[PDB]
Design a protein around this ligand. Structure first.
Ligand code: CLA
Ligand code: CLA
Ligand code: CLA
Ligand code: CLA
Ligand code: CLA
Ligand code: CLA
Ligand code: CLA
Ligand code: CLA
Ligand SMILES: CCCCCCCCCCCCCCCCCC(=O)O[C@@H](COC(=O)CCCCCCCCCCCCCCC)COP(=O)(O)OC[C@H](O)CO
Ligand SMILES: CCCCCCCCCCCCCCCCCC(=O)O[C@@H](COC(=O)CCCCCCCCCCCCCCC)COP(=O)(O)OC[C@H](O)CO
Ligand code: SF4
Ligand code: SF4
Lengths: 153, 31, 160, 95, 143, 81, 742
């Protein structure tokens, strides 16, 4: 109960929102015969909604007074999977992309016409450097330690 | 005495006429 | 060849057209008071003011805020007179802005044929001042005449 | 000269070269009656002086506008007369 | 010692049918420019005031309202038809000022006898800061 | 009462500044500070409009010809009327 | 002399030019030095006049680009026919057109977007379409999805044929210059073989296929039990039961007894009460007469045989005292300049599209088209926008002709010279007309707003006030209402139901068309329309006339058609090019078309569209508030924008939520355009300098030096995003409002 928020699996308003969603979906479902393709699509949508609400309840999310889950980014260990773990994953992927791009730009820096390698990407070198960003934190840390990350102009 | 009926035409009509007349005469001067 | 150069001159910013240099159009423009150079500017101003003040009464009376009341004849006409009081005032400011006391007339001294012509006294301080005074007198006279015709003498009219 | 064929520039004649012409000005004499001209000359003489006319126009216009606005009948302008109706309440009770 | 050629008022004008882009009141109260050239063949050119004119063989004189119009027409004549051109400035008082070739030689090519005006013997980045020219009429670039 | 056109000593000697002038402000004068033995000059800045075509063709690192906009006349405002 | 002049194998088919970007010109093929090059590569891609100075290669590239465009159009048509065959409810819509919404697109069940599959009816869930393809297919006699599949396959084959022809007529067998300059044979073939024969073939299809199938459909026969269209061709008696004149064959045609064909060729007019569209017999007779007129109008111009007309002689024969030499020299101008032809054809096609939109709204030619309010609104708005864009492009390319292809030394025209000589008079008179129209059209709205805000409703320009009645338009409506009485006795009913009378067509409880009243509000809106059109004309014509020279820049033609400025000189020479005149006129065309479509939407929602009760009364969508509310800007803001935007702001959670998202996104893009429109390049370049330093600090700066967008490109991006946002806003608002309530 952080910041006066009830858990989503013990929230009456969360179940109420699920009830409204299922009622609207059933009202849409009543227009078609049960063996038809639109009826099957609506039933699949209802099952997806039920699974979504059950997963949101079981994930440990804290639901506000309006029945919607509220993310906590203060760093609480109960809610590290809302911001901190996806944030670390995003930082890893973004560092991968940035390191691969920087390595490609460094590799084609000392050429006769480097710009020709930017409008037309040299695919073998790019594919060689693609997996170099898997170990981007180690390479970046060592390059910073050896003073190769920055340029003193 | 109704003072708005005297000052509102004075400030909205007569004073602007005097002001833009004087400023037009002063701007177009060749000293 | 109907469209000619301006007085045979192709390097002047204008053209000679039947709307510009027709004999009837030239006659009509020359007989207007503004283009009567040999006449006193007081008389031309009187005529211009009479015409303009006479034509100004109609819109103010017929389209004024009190056009549907008993005061349609007077107040709107008064507004027309007020506009004349504005308009002559503007003219007066023009007469102070453009022309000086010590300078002569700046009107052209030639004609289309190139002969020497006495310049128009209108483009001068005294001439424009007389023109403006005549315009004011003619404007108030025309407004009074329009009011007298429509509402004092009660002449029959369609009133738009 | 300026009037010869295919030539339009004269050094001694600038007004024709630069098109300084009276396009519609006519040197015809006065068409108005002499008595009419005399009456309009003596009856519009005080308005000749332009500075005096400007001052007179400003003072007369201001005085007439103030006199008309202050002494207008109450039934002419709706603003001169009051509401002549009971005032209505606000949507929270006059607050 | 190059002497400026005198203006010939009796110079015939190109055959033009009239345009609204010609002279205005500025030609009367202020100056107006006059370009003279020598066409070796009766041909047709494009006026800078809109439209097309037909220049006549021999000397040709054209009056325009701006110096830029005169220079544009002269550049067109030199590049397309290869005609020598000179234009003057005429005042309402009748004064004529011989403008374009100030020494008879075109300004693009070097000619001895020209004096330097607006010449600064420093790089552009060595200009004095405005704080050092404050409360004085002198500008940093004028020093 | 004219735009201020200034020539600096970094001028190579290319006449493009003079050829790009639509009002005949600049000209080429003899000099000795470059290979071309010539430098630009602005004796007729009274006819300068301020179009800055001259400094749009200067090939130096920064402009050897500089047009500073200043007090404007009828021929500096490009008025044909 | 008019032969097939074709050179064999002029261009080698290879991928070498694919590997090199910007091969077409020289300054660009050198390689990128800055980022601006990339933008330039997408700016001069289709400017064939700048790539080469030879007219033959330019014409061949134009011909093959036209072939590629035709291939793309055929591909798009195949896609529409396929998405009408599969993923559509056309067969369901055929049975109940008055209660089932047309739909031809279904979304996949991903990320919750399946909410866009709305209950359109007929046992189908999908996106409701407003293109009116269902009405076309019903008017064509299509009653099965197999026919749509066959049409899609045929259009795919035709797209492949167009692509092959485009490759063939440039890389293998390219026409010569004299082949393209044979304008007389081209006009003859395009008037007799393209329009005339096409109209004749479509009339044959309507007579032999559309008429019996639509008669069976309107007779209540079930679509699957209707005989196939080929069965009515092999069996003449099957067609003769519906139309007995078919028992006589073509002998009444060959004996000039055409009055015997008065059962399927009728001049009836009006609308079909069963379907709410034009009579298909009327369309058949119309297309037949149009085919005859075009076929006898296509044998006019001269060719290899001495009979015919010469365009050059016809043009040279028309010259008056005012115009001097007249139209002499225009043939050489039009036969040697593609930009002049593009200007003329763009203007004519835009005006044609505008008149098409007006005549489709006024006369619905397809069954169940008028009662489909969404289709009518979408078609009118779309073709209005297309016409406005083409009209703007007309002046855009006329300016290119004036800058590039115009010269009086050779190909001199007297009319163009006399136009250019008095251009100041034209521009000043049009300026005065624009000011006068703006005052006496919009100051009336301001006056009405002030009188209503001051509590003086008797002083406004209303119907219950000072009246500005369109007496001329009302007289025209009255004249066209009584046209069957005296002026057109052969017509049973009037040409439309929008003039007058007691006529009223209602299908399925919805009003199709009504006699449209004209009052003071229509007067004010039409004069607003005239003012906006005149201002757009002023901007575009000023750009065209001053594209070469003016009193400010006498050598503007040397600067080019598309240049930013001439520096801060002469007080400032910003946006002096004709391209900037087009860029400014784009906004005014947008404004004019927006006002036009707002007028159309509100007027048809208040005075035409609605519902018919069983007793006989008619209740409109907005209750006829156009007469009293549209005379004030506050009325447009409240009763039109605020009132009808409730159907697009409340669409969240339903099948119309995509329209709300597009509403918000279009507002966002329109706001985003103001950044490019209001700013300048120097600030962005100076900021890019600091960003470049930040990248250079970490050895990650690119070799292609980043540069801010150019001045012209900044204006182009601003106007493009502005038009996109301001048009998509109206698109989403119109679609959501007219689908939710109509
Ligand atoms: C732009 C057009 C426009 C027009 C046509 C009108 C029209 C009208 N208004 Mg509105 N109004 C407007 C905009 C406009 N308004 C705007 C922008 C505002 C500001 C919010 C107002 C606010 C307003 C107020 C506050 C009032 C009006 C009122 C009136 C009346 C004018 C009364 C008067 O004193 O003037 C008449 C003036 C004239 C001198 C007319 C001159 C026109 C002449 C005749 C031209 C004819 C041209 C000629 C043929 C050209 C060729 C000549 C030939 C020899 C060659 C009239 C019904 C009054 C009212 O309530 O009555 C309904 C009033 O009290 N209006
Ligand atoms: C400094 C700011 C100030 C402002 C914004 C206003 C604003 C207003 N005054 Mg007030 N007023 C002021 C100071 C100010 N007054 C002072 C110092 C006095 C002298 C005691 C007055 C006495 C006054 C009178 C007698 C009247 C107004 C009126 C008005 C209105 C019309 C303007 C006018 O007629 O000016 C007139 C200004 C002065 C005589 C001198 C100003 C110095 C306007 C709402 C009119 C009214 O009440 O209408 C609702 C009116 O009749 N004012
Ligand atoms: C802020 C000051 C101001 C004032 C005091 C007024 C006053 C008035 N407005 Mg308004 N008006 C204003 C601003 C102002 N206006 C602005 C900014 C606009 C432009 C949007 C308008 C546009 C406008 C229109 C279009 C109309 C009015 C009219 C009216 C009149 C309302 C009804 C009535 O009295 O008719 C009775 C009217 C009269 C008896 C006129 C009396 C004027 C006297 C007798 C004239 C002599 C002096 C005169 C004021 C000029 C000289 C003074 C100075 C310039 C030297 C009244 C005179 C109406 C009008 O006056 O037409 C009849 C009208 O039609 N006004
Ligand atoms: C005018 C252009 C046009 C447009 C805008 C659409 C639009 C659409 N089509 Mg249609 N279609 C068209 C022409 C067009 N079609 C034609 C000519 C045909 C005949 C072959 C079809 C047949 C068709 C089918 C069979 C299907 C669609 C589907 C779709 C949807 C996109 C799904 C998809 O492609 O993503 C996937 C995109 C990819 C990039 C995958 C690779 C495909 C390659 C690159 C495409 C070119 C290969 C040939 C969308 C509603 C789908 C649908 O609506 O199902 C519910 C679908 O299944 N279309
Ligand atoms: C009577 C036969 C004829 C026909 C039908 C056409 C029709 C057409 N021409 Mg024209 N043309 C003709 C004779 C003909 N032309 C002649 C003799 C010349 C030389 C003087 C030209 C010169 C010409 C040029 C230079 C251009 C055209 C273009 C076009 C197209 C523009 C209209 C449009 O796309 O509507 C849509 C119309 C249809 C899709 C309806 C079906 C028409 C079929 C598909 C066309 C087959 C017609 C062809 C002439 C005959 C086949 C040749 C054979 C070897 C296979 C259109 C396909 C423009 C274009 O788009 O080119 C690609 C173009 O750039 N034409
Ligand atoms: C002011 C009067 C006038 C008007 C109103 C029009 C209006 C029209 N003309 Mg033009 N025309 C005129 C004068 C005029 N013309 C003159 C004097 C000539 C003789 C030089 C021509 C030559 C001409 C031709 C040869 C053709 C037109 C066509 C058309 C229509 C274009 C169809 C379109 O929008 O694309 C919609 C799609 C298409 C049908 C057109 C396809 C594209 C065409 C074939 C390309 C234009 C090429 C042209 C020959 C340029 C070659 C340059 C060469 C010298 C290198 C348009 C309505 C076309 C037409 O007849 O359409 C039925 C057409 O084929 N015009
Ligand atoms: C009918 C056919 C037509 C044709 C064949 C041409 C032909 C041409 N035009 Mg003209 N033009 C037309 C209509 C036409 N125009 C119309 C209707 C307009 C008014 C908008 C113009 C306005 C115009 C201008 C302003 C200019 C030309 C110029 C050109 C030339 C080069 C075009 C270019 O390189 O662009 C290549 C292609 C592009 C740059 C594509 C740009 C992307 C567009 C703007 C976006 C459309 C948005 C899209 C619907 C939204 C989807 C979202 C997105 C995520 C996909 C070429 C002669 C140019 C010229 O000649 O330069 C000297 C030029 O300056 N035209
Ligand atoms: C939304 C506001 C707006 C307004 C009011 C204007 C106004 C105008 N535009 Mg501009 N314009 C705008 C936005 C706007 N523009 C935008 C967004 C662009 C970018 C594309 C442009 C670009 C542009 C171009 C490219 C052109 C114009 C032109 C015009 C003028 C023609 C209309 C006319 O004169 O009628 C009369 C005036 C108006 C309708 C303005 C409102 C006046 C009301 C009716 C009366 C005000 C009452 C009265 C004056 C009392 C004053 C009170 C006193 C206290 C002072 C006019 C000055 C055209 C022009 O120059 O042609 C002459 C032109 O070519 N505009
Ligand atoms: C968090 C606090 C970070 C303090 C950073 C400020 C200290 C100086 C930064 C200098 C730098 O980035 O480089 C150093 C290396 O970086 C560091 O030592 C700082 C590492 C920061 C990350 C670790 C901090 C603690 C994290 C705890 C969790 C030393 O390299 P150099 O200048 O000797 O290299 C010269 C080269 O060989 C060419 O001659
Ligand atoms: C106001 C607009 C005035 C335009 C005048 C244009 C002009 O010069 O007049 C022509 C047209 O005269 C008019 O009737 C002008 C009509 C003005 C109104 C235009 C709008 C249409 C209504 C002359 O025709 P023409 O017979 O001398 O030769 C025409 C052509 O070259 C074929 O010979
Ligand atoms: S001023 Fe510019 S153009 Fe002239 S010489 Fe110097 S660098 Fe060359
Ligand atoms: S602000 Fe931009 S468009 Fe305007 S003059 Fe300067 S550079 Fe040219």
């Amino acid at each position: 109960d952080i910041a006066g928020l009830t858990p989503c699996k013990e929230s009456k308003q969360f179940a109420k929102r699920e009830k409204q969603a299922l009622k609207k979906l059933q009202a849409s479902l009543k227009l078609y015969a049960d063996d038809s393709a639109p009826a099957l699509a609506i039933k699949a949508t209802m099952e997806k909604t039920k699974k979504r609400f059950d997963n949101y309840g079981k994930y440990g999310l804290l639901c506000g007074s309006d029945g919607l889950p509220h993310l906590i980014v203060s760093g609480d260990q109960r809610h590290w999977g809302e911001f901190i773990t996806p944030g670390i994953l995003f930082l890893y992927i973004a560092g991968w992309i940035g390191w691969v791009g920087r390595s490609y730009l460094i590799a084609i820096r000392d050429e006769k016409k480097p710009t020709q390698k930017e409008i037309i990407i040299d695919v073998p070198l790019a594919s060689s450097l693609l997996f170099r960003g898997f170990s981007w934190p180690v390479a970046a840390y060592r390059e910073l330690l050896n003073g190769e990350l920055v340029d003193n102009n | 005495m109704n003072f708005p009926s005297i000052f509102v035409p004075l400030v909205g009509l007569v004073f602007p006429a005097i002001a833009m007349a004087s400023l037009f005469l002063y701007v177009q001067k060749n000293k | 060849q109907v469209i000619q150069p301006l007085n045979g001159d192709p390097f002047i910013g204008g053209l000679e057209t039947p709307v510009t240099s027709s004999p009837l159009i030239a006659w009509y423009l020359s007989n207007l008071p503004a283009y009567r150079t040999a006449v006193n500017p007081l008389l031309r101003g009187v005529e211009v003011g009479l015409a303009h003040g006479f034509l100004l009464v109609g819109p103010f009376v017929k389209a004024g805020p009190l056009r549907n009341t008993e005061y349609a004849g007077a107040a709107g006409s008064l507004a027309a007179a007020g506009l004349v009081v504005i308009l002559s005032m503007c003219l007066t400011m023009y007469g102070i802005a453009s022309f000086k006391e010590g300078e002569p007339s700046i009107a052209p001294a030639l004609t289309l044929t190139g002969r020497k012509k006495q310049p128009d006294q209108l483009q001068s301080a005294d001439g424009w001042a007389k023109f403006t005074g005549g315009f004011f007198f003619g404007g108030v006279s025309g407004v009074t005449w329009a009011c007298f015709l429509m509402y004092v003498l009660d002449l029959p009219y369609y009133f738009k | 000269k300026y009037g010869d064929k295919s030539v339009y520039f004269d050094l001694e004649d600038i007004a024709n070269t630069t098109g300084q012409w009276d396009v519609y000005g006519s040197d015809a004499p006065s068409p108005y009656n002499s008595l009419q001209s005399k009456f309009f000359e003596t009856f519009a003489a005080p308005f000749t002086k332009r500075g005096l006319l400007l001052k007179f126009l400003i003072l007369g216009g201001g005085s007439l506008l103030t006199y008309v606005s202050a002494n207008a009948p109450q039934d002419v302008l709706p603003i001169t007369r009051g509401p002549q109706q009971p005032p209505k309440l606000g949507p929270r009770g006059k607050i | 010692g190059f002497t400026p050629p005198e203006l010939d008022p009796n110079t015939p004008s190109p055959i033009f049918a009239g345009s609204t882009g010609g002279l205005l009141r500025k030609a009367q109260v202020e100056e107006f420019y006059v370009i003279t050239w020598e066409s070796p063949k009766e041909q047709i050119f494009e006026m800078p005031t809109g439209g097309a004119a037909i220049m006549r063989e021999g000397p040709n004189l054209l009056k325009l309202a701006r110096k830029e119009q005169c220079l544009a027409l002269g550049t067109r004549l030199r590049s397309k038809y290869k005609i020598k051109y000179q234009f003057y400035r005429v005042f309402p008082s009748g004064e004529v000022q011989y403008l374009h070739p100030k020494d008879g030689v075109y300004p693009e090519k070097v000619n001895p006898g020209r004096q330097g005006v607006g010449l600064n013997m420093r790089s552009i980045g060595k200009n004095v800061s405005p704080i050092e020219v404050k409360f004085t009429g002198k500008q940093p670039y004028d020093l | 009462m004219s735009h201020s056109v200034k020539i600096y000593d970094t001028c190579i000697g290319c006449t493009q500044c003079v050829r790009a002038c639509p009002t005949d402000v600049l000209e080429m004068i003899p000099w000795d500070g470059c290979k071309a033995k010539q430098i630009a000059s602005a004796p007729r800045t009274e006819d300068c409009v301020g179009c800055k075509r001259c400094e749009s063709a200067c090939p130096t690192d920064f402009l050897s010809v500089r047009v500073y906009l200043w007090h404007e006349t009828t021929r500096s405002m490009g008025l044909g009327y | 002399e008019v032969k097939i002049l074709v050179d064999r194998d002029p261009v080698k088919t290879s991928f070498e030019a694919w590997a090199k970007p910007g091969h077409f010109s020289r300054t660009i093929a050198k390689g990128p030095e800055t980022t601006t090059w990339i933008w330039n590569l997408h700016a001069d891609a289709h400017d064939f006049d700048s790539h080469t100075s030879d007219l033959e290669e330019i014409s061949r590239k134009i011909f093959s680009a036209h072939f590629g465009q035709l291939s793309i159009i055929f591909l798009w048509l195949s896609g529409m026919y396929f998405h009408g065959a599969r993923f559509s409810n056309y067969e369901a819509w055929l049975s109940d057109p008055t209660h089932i919404g047309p739909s031809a697109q279904v979304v996949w069940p991903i990320v919750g977007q399946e909410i866009l599959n709305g209950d359109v009816g007929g046992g189908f869930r999908g996106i409701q379409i407003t293109s009116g393809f269902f009405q076309i297919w019903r008017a064509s006699g299509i009653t099965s999805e197999l026919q749509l599949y066959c049409t899609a396959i045929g259009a795919l084959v035709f797209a492949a044929l167009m692509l092959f022809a485009g490759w063939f007529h440039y890389h293998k067998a390219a026409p010569k210059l004299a082949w393209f300059q044979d304008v007389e044979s081209m006009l003859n073939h395009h008037l007799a073989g393209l329009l005339g024969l096409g109209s004749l073939s479509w009339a044959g299809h309507q007579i032999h296929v559309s008429l019996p199938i639509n008669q069976f459909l309107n007779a209540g026969v079930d679509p699957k039990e209707i005989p196939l269209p080929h069965e009515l061709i092999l069996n003449r008696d099957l067609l003769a039961q519906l139309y007995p004149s078919f028992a006589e064959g073509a002998t009444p045609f060959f004996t000039l007894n055409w009055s015997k064909y008065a059962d399927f060729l009728t001049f009836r007019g009006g609308l079909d009460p069963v379907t709410g569209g034009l009579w298909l017999t009327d369309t058949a007779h119309h297309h037949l007469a149009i085919a005859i007129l075009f076929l006898i109008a296509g044998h006019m111009y001269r060719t290899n045989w001495g009979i015919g007309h010469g365009l050059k002689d016809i043009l040279e024969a028309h010259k008056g005292p005012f115009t001097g030499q007249g139209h002499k020299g225009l043939y050489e101008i039009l036969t040697t300049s593609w930009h002049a032809q593009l200007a003329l054809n763009l203007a004519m096609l835009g005006s044609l599209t505008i008149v098409v939109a007006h005549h489709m709204y006024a006369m619905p030619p397809y069954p169940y088209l008028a009662t489909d309010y969404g289709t009518q609104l979408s078609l009118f708005t779309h073709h209005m926008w297309i016409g406005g864009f083409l009209i703007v492009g007309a002046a855009a390319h006329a300016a290119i002709f004036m800058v590039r292809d115009y010269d009086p030394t050779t190909r001199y025209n007297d009319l163009l010279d006399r136009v250019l000589r008095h251009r100041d008079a034209i521009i000043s008179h049009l300026n005065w007309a624009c000011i006068f129209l703006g005052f006496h059209s919009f100051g009336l709205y301001i006056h009405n707003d002030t009188m209503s805000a001051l509590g003086r409703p008797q002083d406004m320009f209303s119907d219950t006030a000072i009246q500005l009645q369109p007496v001329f338009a009302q007289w025209i409506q009255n004249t066209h209402a009584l046209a069957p009485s005296a002026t057109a006795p052969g017509a049973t009913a009037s040409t439309s139901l929008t003039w007058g009378g007691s006529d009223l067509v209602a299908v399925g409880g919805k009003v199709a068309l009504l006699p449209i009243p004209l009052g003071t509000a229509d007067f004010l809106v039409h004069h607003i329309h005239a003012f906006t059109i005149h201002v757009t004309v002023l901007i575009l014509l000023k750009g065209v006339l001053f594209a070469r020279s003016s009193r400010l820049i006498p050598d503007k033609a040397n600067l080019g058609f598309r240049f930013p400025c001439d520096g801060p000189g002469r007080g400032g020479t910003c946006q002096v090019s004709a391209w900037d005149h087009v860029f400014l006129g784009l906004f005014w065309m947008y404004n004019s078309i927006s006002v036009v479509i707002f007028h159309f939407s509100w007027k048809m929602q208040s005075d035409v569209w609605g519902s018919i009760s069983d007793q006989g009364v008619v209740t409109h969508i907005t209750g006829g508030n156009f007469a009293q509310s549209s005379i004030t800007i506050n009325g447009w803001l409240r009763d039109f924008l605020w009132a009808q935007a409730s159907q697009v702001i409340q669409s969240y959670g339903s099948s119309l939520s995509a329209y709300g998202l597009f509403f918000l996104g279009a507002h966002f893009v329109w706001a985003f355009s103001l950044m490019f429109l209001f700013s300048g390049r120097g600030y962005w370049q100076e900021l890019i300098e600091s960003i470049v330093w930040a990248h250079n600090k970490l050895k990650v700066a690119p070799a292609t030096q980043p540069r801010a967008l150019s001045i012209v490109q900044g204006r182009a991006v601003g106007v493009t995003h502005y038009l996109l946002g301001g048009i998509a806003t109206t698109w989403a608002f119109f679609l959501a409002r007219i689908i939710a309530v109509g």
